[PDB]
From Swiss-Prot:
It is found in: Cytoplasmic vesicle. The keyword Signal applies. This is Thaumatin I. Pfam families: Thaumatin. The keyword Protein biosynthesis does not apply. SMART domains: THN (SM00205).
Length: 207
């Protein structure tokens, strides 16, 4: 499957793509404002994620640091990124269908649209100014808006027992972005697409 990753932000981002225990395609690349990077994701990829990283520095070997979404200091991500990270999430070719969503469960750094480029389903979007409106206690000094689990490490926010409810913090993310997961047991906003669809992830879709 092809994923065109497009940076419409006025600032550089470093795109990342991983399934947690491996890179997807090259795993990461710099995207200046306006740049597009097309990756190939193997059919059947389960639990894949694409995200943006901000304010990165990498040496000539591709080692360094990002202020949001850092993946063990690598340009080419092999693992998931450090919150806060707005997440485009996907599982492909799962019994004949693809499943896509956006999640704020690991916080928010960059607005995103995640849409099919092929027929048969709708896209999802979280493009509100979550960083600007972020509750004081969730603001990440490094940049972005942390989820409450990251900040407070409680069973309730992290849904450790599988018994959690919505919270004042989750409701903030849900209010700003109804179409993204705000906590682990949120009413799903997952979209079912035809198996083997192709996609575009656009950072800063509205600005």
């Amino acid at each position: 499957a092809t994923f065109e990753i497009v940076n419409r932000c006025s600032y550089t981002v470093w795109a990342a793509a991983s399934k947690g225990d491996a890179a997807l395609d090259a795993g990461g690349r710099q995207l200046n404002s306006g740049e597009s990077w097309t990756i190939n994701v193997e059919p059947g990829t389960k639990g894949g994620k694409i995200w943006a990283r901000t304010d990165c520095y990498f040496d000539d070997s591709g080692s360094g640091i990002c202020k949001t979404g850092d993946c063990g200091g690598l340009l080419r991500c092999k693992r998931f990124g450090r919150p806060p990270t707005t997440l485009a999430e996907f599982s492909l070719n799962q019994y004949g269908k693809d499943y896509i969503d956006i999640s704020n469960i690991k916080g928010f750094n960059v607005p995103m649209d995640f849409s099919p480029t092929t027929r048969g389903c709708r896209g999802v979007r979280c493009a509100a100014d979550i960083v600007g409106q972020c509750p004081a206690k969730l603001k990440a000094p490094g940049g972005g808006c942390n989820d409450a689990c990251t900040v407070f490490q409680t069973s309730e926010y992290c849904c450790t027992t599988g018994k959690c409810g919505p919270t004042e913090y989750s409701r903030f993310f849900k209010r700003l972005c109804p179409d993204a997961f705000s906590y682990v047991l949120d009413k799903p906003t997952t979209v079912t697409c035809p198996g083997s669809s192709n996609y575009r992830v656009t950072f800063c879709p509205t600005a």
